[PDB]
């Protein structure tokens, strides 16, 4: 009805990170008619704009509120897996850390035309950096805004750095400079613009919404891609009125393409609902098989986390980031609001987890462990739960105790999971299994166990033991290797990556879902341009790599670049 009597050159399923980039580049010359379908609303919330309000976005209406299947290897728990639901997608709800990983991550993909030397200029072309000028590893002029964080905790950030040096880590002055090793300690840059969230809606989509050839629908939930076999994508079915709503169809112009941009959870889900998937699974829900692809929904990679936390001594009460945001009765400090509005500075600019380190726990080629230091104390062993608790704590009249947290992440994990269907209803949540700690060697568990040892060694250093008064998590009860393993099974949570569910592959790779041109095997006019295509997860947060893929895909589709 908003699409009745319209042919589109491109239909984007999802209005998230990759989609905002494609919408901008594909609508640019004005010849092409581009439709964007997003299930969630427009990007207008103040909780999106203020980085510290990430605490409020978890388990909110701007999240999909996805829970995994019971994981029997994780003390029979469901895992919450946060995902953004609005224009800008997970770029709008994320912790804003800017990581490319290492050159070696892209070389390890082994896909023709996607080596480190192929992808570097696409990272650089996207970037404007406030704190690095142009050079081999940094661009000036791209739409992304990257900066050094505008909040520093003078005592605790300094102390973490001195402690890391005491246990023998070297400083890394730029985690995105591929001329030096990934390992070491320092400051993560953030996708922020003077302390405001610089998401891909703000940077890519919002500036070009005036365009006549670009149509964006919100509250538009795609139910399947329409594919005919007389196999050719025709367009897309969606509802604007939830599950009971009338199914509408958006149709392609001749030579038009459907681009899947629904992310590493919802893209394989929708492909299965469209008959692109393993025949065994599709037959169980009476879905006609159009392209029998074993790899759709397999190879799910996510970077699991656990943490330590420790209170500061009574004489250091009031020095934590929790003290910079909340007063002793849980009111937001006037000083914090004033610094944010006057100069884009202070605690409201922080997502908390923007200092840390990459570490090799056992002489691996690339670091297996990421550390995120937070100058505030977790009150739950589940860091995402604690961020929720921090949002709900406002105006409750209590004091959040001053301390620190170290989050340990298996950043190059060996375990893989899957996403499938639990029902034939396209409005049902996916069957989601993260598969943490299932790798056959127990490498991921070993990484997190050694991470806890490492965090305890850092907290025992001169530089930090000056501040600290004991340990809250994992605590006195958790000392032996077997006690640590049990704590990890019970507390493990997502560091919120999720890639690889529609893996890109070389010719002859029967486990691949898309080729090196991002075309789905056995369907004409169907591409995937989102986190699902990443073959092997890079070390670090996965937002910047998604934008790099979307930039290169835009260049390919508009004839400006080739791959191979
Ligand atoms: C809490 C959190 C913290 C993170 N922290 C960081 C970080 O610090 N730094 C970093 O670089 N990365 C981080 N990430 C990861 C990064 O945000 C993602 O990897 C990246 O944004 C994914 O981009 P995408 O385009 O693949 O998907 P998304 O940005 O998730 O976009 C997918 C879109 O499809 C929409 N959609 C789904 N189903 C349908 C349907 N049926 N119809 C229509 N639309 C639909 C969704 O609502 C969504 O908007 C974080 C992620 C989360 C959730
Ligand atoms: C616990 C999490 C903190 C949440 C922060 C709430 C901030 C309330 C302060 C009053 C609103 C700030 C002014 C509105 C700024 C809108 C954002 C912007 O335009 O950059
Ligand atoms: C701006 C937020 C300040 C919050 C202070 C809360 C106290 C510290 C708890 C730290 C928990 C570990 C970090 C969890 C990171 C969650 C975000 C993410 O994964 O993207």
Swiss-Prot record:
List ligand-binding residues for hexadecanoate: 353, 372, 387, 407
Identification of the protein by name: Fatty acid photodecarboxylase, chloroplastic
Summary of activators and inhibitors of this protein: Activated by blue light and repressed by red light.
In its UniProt entry, the species of origin is given as: Chlorella variabilis
What does the function comment of this entry state?
A: Catalyzes the decarboxylation of free fatty acids to n-alkanes or n-alkenes in response to blue light. Substrate preference is toward fatty acids with C16 or C17 chains. Converts n-octanoic acid (C8 chain) more efficiently than palmitate (n-hexadecanoic acid, C16 chain) into n-heptane (C7 chain) and n-pentadecane (C15 chain), respectively, partly due to an autocatalytic effect of its n-heptane product. Saturated fatty acids are converted to alkanes, not alkenes. The decarboxylation is initiated through electron abstraction from the fatty acid by the photo-excited FAD.
- Could you read off the lineage of the organism from its UniProt record? Eukaryota, Viridiplantae, Chlorophyta, core chlorophytes, Trebouxiophyceae
Which prosthetic group or cofactor does it need?
A: FAD
Which residue stretches, if any, does this entry annotate as coiled coil? none
Question: How is the cofactor bound, in the record's words?
Answer: Binds 1 FAD per subunit.
Task: Note the biotech application.
Answer: May be used in light-driven, bio-based production of hydrocarbons. The oleaginous yeast Yarrowia lipolytica expressing FAP from Chlorella variabilis under blue light conditions produces odd-numbered alkanes and alkenes, which could be used as drop-in biofuel.
Binding annotation for FAD:
17-18, 38, 86, 90, 94-97, 222, 543
Keyword Ribonucleoprotein set for record: no
